[PDB]
Amino acid sequence: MEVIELNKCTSGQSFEVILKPPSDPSLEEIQKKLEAAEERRKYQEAELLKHLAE
Amino acid sequence: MYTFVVRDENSSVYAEVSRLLLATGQWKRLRKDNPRFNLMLGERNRLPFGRLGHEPGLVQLVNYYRGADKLCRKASLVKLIKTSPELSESCTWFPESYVIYPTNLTDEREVFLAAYNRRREGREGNVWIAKSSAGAGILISSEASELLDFIDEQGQVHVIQKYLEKPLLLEPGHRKFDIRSWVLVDHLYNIYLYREGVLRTSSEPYNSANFQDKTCHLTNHCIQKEYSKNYGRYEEGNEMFFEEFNQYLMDALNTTLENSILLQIKHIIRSCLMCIEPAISTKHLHYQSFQLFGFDFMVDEELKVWLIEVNGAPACAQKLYAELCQGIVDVAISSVFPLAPTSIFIKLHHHH
Amino acid sequence: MREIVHIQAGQCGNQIGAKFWEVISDEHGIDPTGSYHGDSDLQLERINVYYNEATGNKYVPRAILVDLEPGTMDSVRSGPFGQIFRPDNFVFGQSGAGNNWAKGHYTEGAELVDSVLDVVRKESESCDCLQGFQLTHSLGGGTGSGMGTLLISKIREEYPDRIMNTFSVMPSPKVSDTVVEPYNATLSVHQLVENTDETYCIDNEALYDICFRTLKLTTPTYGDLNHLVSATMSGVTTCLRFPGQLNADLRKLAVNMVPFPRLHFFMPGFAPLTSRQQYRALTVPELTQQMFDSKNMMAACDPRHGRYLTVAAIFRGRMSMKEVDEQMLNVQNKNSSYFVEWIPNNVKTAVCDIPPRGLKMSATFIGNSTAIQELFKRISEQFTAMFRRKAFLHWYTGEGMDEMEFTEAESNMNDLVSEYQQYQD
Amino acid sequence: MRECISIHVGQAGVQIGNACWELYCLEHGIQPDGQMPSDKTIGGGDDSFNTFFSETGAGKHVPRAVFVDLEPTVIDEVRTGTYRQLFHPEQLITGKEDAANNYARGHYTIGKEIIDLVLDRIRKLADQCTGLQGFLVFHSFGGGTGSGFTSLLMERLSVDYGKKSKLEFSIYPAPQVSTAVVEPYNSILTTHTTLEHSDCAFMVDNEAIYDICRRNLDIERPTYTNLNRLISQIVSSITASLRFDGALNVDLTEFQTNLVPYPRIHFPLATYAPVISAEKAYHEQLSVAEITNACFEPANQMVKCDPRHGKYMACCLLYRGDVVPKDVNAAIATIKTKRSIQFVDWCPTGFKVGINYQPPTVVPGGDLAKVQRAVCMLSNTTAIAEAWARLDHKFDLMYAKRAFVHWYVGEGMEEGEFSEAREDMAALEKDYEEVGVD
């Protein structure tokens, strides 16, 4: 049971107590994943229209 | 209309509970994967406790206390007793035990040899037993070399505890035995003891000069019916119930089962369960727990009761399946999901 | 501002859509001339969803009346609320469809489709943000079925990412105009499978049995049958038309209800259904128990013959929402054998404080149930019963169709039955 | 002094943000018009509350926040509500149609066309920060915007603000207050693409806030208003260190340093008490020991789980009110001897404690009662993995049948991103078991 790093100010205080000691995707890649999904939408919508065209 | 699911097809205990629940006409069974259930008869290993108590409006109840493995594992029980101040290392009703890990993997190897060498020096009975939860595999020997060399030949956690060289022997026969007490704990943590116990006896005379033949030293119901030759001679199925056993105690030793044995057992069950209450209690938990326990005891020639182990998924004697299973529904299941005596239990009151 | 575009086609499509605009118009406090006279602001909250706001605070329904003969639409115009519709939104021909899908979809209807779309486009361009379309129509006739699906096929082409929900009346031999209704029905079903997002299946037999058996009407009428559809259509739209903790548009509503693209056919239900013992106060249990009763459903399908994928329920009136949760959780936990266990929480509930005209409280049921396969099975049986002999095909081959197209519609729906079957087990 | 930018994404994020800034104002004595009488430095200053508010030459204290929603209904309330004068129209971003509870729709379809705008509005707040610390991102797991758009915003924030910390406040999906069914998908999708980009995430399970409102506040059926005024108390207590004078948790970095030893396990459990109904006659004020001892009941955890069957990696005690260190240590001792607190062998068994004397502020007319002392305990337990298990199981029940997958594929997402996310979760559940089970 030990109290360390006791800090005090006007609006309170804080301390630490010890009971026992121990024993990314770049900006380019993001645009690609985004545009890749847009490309899969454009193609899936195209297949619908081609179906309706037929 | 209450609903329950069955996740353990091998449980002979709750196979009858399910049969009774359905006989009530008010409990409907569901598929083992349907989450909309009131009561769960869960699996033994890796039961998904984390998924219980999250169905709006449904109050859920499971038949296993999360964390009870601390009490029903060989190496876990020993570590619990020694580390728990409530039980202390100086516990007088639990055999001096030690947890031993095979050398191919803390470990009390050296502490065991110290207490072993002290006994060998003091001419005291130095016969130990090696066992583990991964057994049906047990070795009894008075030499420390054999015991340790036997665990190294395995690969799981073992426990070496003192072998009771002076066990109480029945007559006629001169045979060993153990006691099985079924203790049911409901959601309120009431400790109910089954008024009816059983004694799995040995049909072979006890022989302390030959620990090689383990038919007269082990009292498991499966060993006697396979390797023993006097199975069923004295009693049916190597099982004597509390009525015949109480009559024998009064005739031979001039004492009763209540005063000579039952008091200690009721004390062990209480101390063991009160100890871990603040760790497994479901008092303020989003779900509720209950569990049946199968305590195994030993009785020496001085009428002192020792604790062997605790079984988390124990079986029952053929003759008591009906009475016990019915009580499980009365105080454990219907007590939460009421339906539209002379309790078969003995309540062990305590401070929560 | 999430606006909806309403389309009603053919005799059945318009008489149902007509009364529909009559029922919600009363709920939103709009009179037959388009003037508001309600007592609550909740009536105007989501008012722009089905009504355009004209000059002088006039509210003009955003509906397009379509038909190949002038008779029915003349009735609506002279009807009670006829003067409320936009005079331009009346698009009709004169030949009629002859209860023939081919005429409505290929020959006659084709000559009028572009003009109908010119009005649809005119309404959409004014929508600050279009939610999607809704079509009322029957499937056993010529116009609502033939041209109705033709319109949907062309609305998905021009509005490919917009929701298209329909109220479709399925034909039953018990309430039958012509013997070719199974032909017209089988053909329209494939279009809805392909292009619609939600199709409320309404079987006239169920509507009949409800008026005859339950409501105790000795001799029902299409008018009596349309009252049930009006009150139901009002219900499933209460979510969109009134505020609450819901806050969802058509696309969000469909997302949580259609787990598979082609299985978007629902079974609606309403409660209470009382015969004239009509002033009895109805409790929350009674409301819930009936709502799940098959006799309170309009697909003429036994739900206990299949399984529920998803279920939406909307409760109307000033009641105990605490008591609603308790009761809904009760039906699920008392019949969890008819819900699929691989979709968690597939039963949702919404409350609305505004009750229908003349009811303390009410419930509306929307079931995406595999039991609906029984519907398409009946239609497929009646179709094969005639197509195996080529009976009555000349009415269709004469309009330009071939036997091959029929054989395909036959196999197209048999697949729809096999799909509903692999999910009931 | 260093600034902190708050971002609010989706319906849940925007309303919870509303409940928070309402609370922050009542605490810092800031009125609805933005004026602060106690602030004597006009137009500037590097005070503690300036980490969340900037100041204008006219004396208005403006939050450092950005609300983002793909549909204008929820943010419009903010534009016309009590605290409309605080924000300016730039800080409020609205689309026209939402993401229909669809992760793919909020991440790819709609997100791609508004991301560069949101960044520009955030860059405008960043340019005011002399020393920006990081961002606090409020959102929901189930919402199409809260899930789909947040994961994208995070990926880009990690590009434009590399060295800045990012804290999450995530709403775990709970059926009792939800009408959607595809929330498991969104949750498991957004946690997969956000994991590497969030330094510390506080998960609040609506199910927990729900039962805390029904049980402690006697609300039979609670509204979002009730749920948010409570969640704003927890958040207020978790951020108070950044807004008030102190020495514990003074900048966002000290959160990871104090709570996250391993990066992937950055989900601390939060516990709060007391929670007393204002409609109550009059309650017996709980002492330090009593309120601290409550921090170990599952009843007042932001996520329902069982810590006794996990292992702690860190532990913070934030106190607000009449609390002194002497009484804190006394409570702590008495609890170790009665509770099951198993720390990981590679972490010290201890507690970091902060005390702010100002007691919890309550919203006039709200549901909560004014107390003299209260505490909030942040603890990193392997027991919170129960949450992921629950969620991951539902995900498996639906995905095994590919239910609703077309709605996501239809927005441009690939079916492989499901299994990829799911296998990521399985790795996260595995790291939790490797750290707490024997």
Ligand SMILES: Nc1nc2c(ncn2[C@@H]2O[C@H](COP(=O)(O)OP(=O)(O)OP(=O)(O)O)[C@@H](O)[C@H]2O)c(=O)[nH]1
């Ligand atoms: N605690 C709390 N939870 C909320 C709140 N609003 C929504 N939620 C939860 O958020 C989940 C749904 O996400 P939303 O925030 O509503 O969706 P969204 O972010 O607006 O995204 P969209 O799908 O495009 O509308 C549900 O499970 C709700 O329980 C709120 O104000 N407080």
Ligand SMILES: Nc1ncnc2c1ncn2[C@@H]1O[C@H](COP(=O)(O)OP(=O)(O)CP(=O)(O)O)[C@@H](O)[C@H]1O
């Ligand atoms: N210390 C000891 N002294 C005397 N006998 C002992 C003993 N430890 C075990 N035994 C014997 O071993 C038997 C119990 O073995 P143990 O319980 O360890 O294995 P097990 O768990 O597979 C049997 P069960 O689970 O059915 O009780 C008892 O019949 C007892 O006679």
Ligand SMILES: Nc1nc2c(ncn2[C@@H]2O[C@H](COP(=O)(O)OP(=O)(O)O)[C@@H](O)[C@H]2O)c(=O)[nH]1
């Ligand atoms: N419920 C209901 N069904 C109708 C109504 N009118 C026609 N039907 C059904 O629709 C089918 C006839 O289709 P119809 O509406 O005449 O198609 P149309 O050619 O577009 O006018 C038959 O099966 C009828 O049972 C109506 O007013 N109400």
Ligand SMILES: NC(=O)c1ccnc(NC2CC=CC2)c1
């Ligand atoms: N077209 C639909 O699927 C639909 C329409 C209106 N309400 C619905 N369900 C309610 C259940 C709780 C909130 C919404 C569903």
Ligand SMILES: [Ca+2]
């Ligand atoms: Ca012509």
Ligand SMILES: [Ca+2]
């Ligand atoms: Ca200042």
Ligand SMILES: [Ca+2]
């Ligand atoms: Ca980073």
Ligand SMILES: [Mg+2]
């Ligand atoms: Mg055993």
Ligand SMILES: [Mg+2]
């Ligand atoms: Mg007709």
Ligand SMILES: [Mg+2]
């Ligand atoms: Mg939204």
